[PDB]
Amino acid sequence: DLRLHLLLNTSVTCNDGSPAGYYLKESRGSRRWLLFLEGGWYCFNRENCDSRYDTMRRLMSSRDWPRTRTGTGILSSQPEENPYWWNANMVFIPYCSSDVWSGASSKSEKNEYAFMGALIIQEVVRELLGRGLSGAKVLLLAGSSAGGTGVLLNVDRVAEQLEKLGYPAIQVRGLADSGWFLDNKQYRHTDCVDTITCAPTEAIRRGIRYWNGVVPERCRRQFQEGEEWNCFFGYKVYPTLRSPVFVVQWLFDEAQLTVDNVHPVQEGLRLYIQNLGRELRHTLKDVPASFAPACLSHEIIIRSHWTDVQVKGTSLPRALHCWDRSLHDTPLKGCPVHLVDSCPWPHCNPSCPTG
Ligand SMILES: *[C@@H]1O[C@H](CO)[C@@H](O)[C@H](O)[C@H]1NC(C)=O
Ligand SMILES: CN1CCC[C@H]1c1cccnc1
């Protein structure tokens, strides 16, 4: 099991001012550390944050968190469930900032909610340095859905943080699961009359202002003031990243359909789905390490059945293992790192998750 630690710096808080924290399972004699960012949408104004606080409160507060958590999938310590990194030090960072891990704005007389996701990550890293992370060889910052996009937004800041603190030996890497989305499937990109039908790019624009959100510096310098929302989209922020990042992305992500307002399928829907898979495949063509199955699904890496999905005969744990080998101080025979399905329809891959 992973054991809860609430941050000693109680000024780095969840949305409601309760302390943020992390679940930790130490593995003495391992110099590999996996920090997993939980996902779970976001809120972007007072009214829909209030709604989230009423019926999704564990995503906004630590008050009701359990003392322990069971590590599953890539967080499992059993080699059967986790052929990749079962012996690693395991950290699960709960998502309680509702800001796609981008916020740097505390509560006050003007802010009723605190949005500190980017600061929570930095504070967890700081505390872990005193619990063995100072001796690490690899820190893998992983995450699913909003946590996957969180990886893209934060992996280079963790690398810079560890360099400035005097730990240049730790190799910081990223693993972004279901965090890679397209912004091009919209009739209107700026209308936001209600929360549910708000355009995805407009929701992010509003969120960034509400959260005092921060994006990676090289990406921010490209798109400049007011256009930081661009850096939430993988194909725009990825080329600016210096840290190695492995991208896990279903070709037909259920959250992509949701932000596109897409729910016997006829020609219009068939063309949308087939074009979506082709466009996602195209955006991944120059990502060196990726795993992108032709499935309609959402998230994978902390699901116990993540061992079972295969692309071109290679499982996700094996792909990550080959990625590890590729980064040890020319492709590898029988150990591929770039695995993107070419077939054009959900479940054309027979290993897709069911239900
Ligand atoms: C707590 O975190 C805040 C935000 O990063 C920082 O400004 C402050 O110096 C920290 N204080 C301590 C005691 O760690
Ligand atoms: C960051 N989120 C994860 C799942 C969907 C993604 C997203 C991207 C852009 C606008 N809203 C949500």
Cβ(24)–Cβ(7) below 8 Å: no
| Amino acid (1-letter code) at residue 350 | P
Q: What is the Å distance from ligand 1's center to 8 Cα?
A: 10
Residues with CB under 6 A from ligand 2: 100, 145-146, 149, 179, 181, 200, 203-204, 232, 255, 259
Cβ(13)–Cβ(111) below 8 Å: no
The whole-angstrom separation of Cα 120 and Cα 142 is 15
Of 145, 243, 290, 315, the catalytic one is 145
Most distant CA pair in the chain, distance = 60
SS3 245: strand
If one residue of 10, 12, 107 were mutated to test the ligand 1 pocket, choosing by the most ligand atoms within 8 A of its CB, it would be: 12
Kindly state if the Cβ of 106 falls inside 6 Å of ligand 1: no
Cβ(242)–Cβ(259) below 8 Å: no
The half-sphere exposure of 239 on its side-chain side, counting CA atoms within 13 A, is: 8
CA 197 to chain centre: 23
Does the annotation mark 194 as catalytic?
no
Experiment used for this model:
X-ray
SS3 154: helix
Cβ(20)–Cβ(96) below 8 Å: yes
Resolution of the determined structure in angstroms stands at: 1.7
Retrieve residue 25's tokens.
């399972």
Ligand nearest to the CA of 117: 1
Tell me whether residue 344 is exposed, middle or buried, using C-beta atoms within 10 angstroms of its C-beta: 0 to 12, 13 to 18, 19 or more: middle
The whole-angstrom separation of Cα 245 and Cα 216 is 14
Retrieve residue 52's tokens.
């989230």
Terminal C-alpha separation, the chain = 25
Of 18, 183, 243, 298, the catalytic one is 298
Cβ(215)–Cβ(237) below 8 Å: yes
Looking at the DSSP bridge assignments, the partners of residue 343 are none
If one residue of 99, 145, 149, 298 were mutated to test the ligand 2 pocket, choosing by the most ligand atoms within 8 A of its CB, it would be: 149
Which single residue is written with the structure tokens 């009359």?
A: 193
The answer for residues whose C-beta is within 8 angstroms of residue 50's C-beta and 6 or more apart is none
Kindly state if the Cβ of 9 falls inside 6 Å of ligand 1: yes
Does the annotation mark 298 as catalytic?
yes
Q: What is the Å distance from ligand 1's center to 77 Cα?
A: 32
Which residues constitute the domain of residue 307?
Answer: 1-355
Does the annotation mark 326 as catalytic?
no
Retrieve residue 203's tokens.
């929701």
Q: Angle at which helices 146-164 and 117-129 pack, to 10 degrees?
A: 50
β-pair type (89-93, 21-25): antiparallel
By C-alpha distance, which of 91, 191, 88, 192 is closest to 142?
91
The pair phi, psi for residue 134, each rounded to 5°, is -60, -25
The whole-angstrom separation of Cα 93 and Cα 34 is 10
Count of the separate structural domains present in the chain:
1
CA 153 to chain centre: 9
Burial 2-21 (b: 16+ CB within 10 A, else e): bebbebeeeebbbbbbbbbb
By C-alpha distance, which of 137, 98, 138 is closest to 118?
98
Cβ(265)–Cβ(221) below 8 Å: no
Other beta carbons within 10 Å of 108: 8
Ligand nearest to the CA of 106: 1
Tell me whether residue 49 is exposed, middle or buried, using C-beta atoms within 10 angstroms of its C-beta: 0 to 12, 13 to 18, 19 or more: buried
By C-alpha distance, which of 312, 305, 308 is closest to 338?
312
Tell me whether residue 350 is exposed, middle or buried, using C-beta atoms within 10 angstroms of its C-beta: 0 to 12, 13 to 18, 19 or more: exposed
Q: E strand or H helix at 254, and its extent?
A: helix 254-259
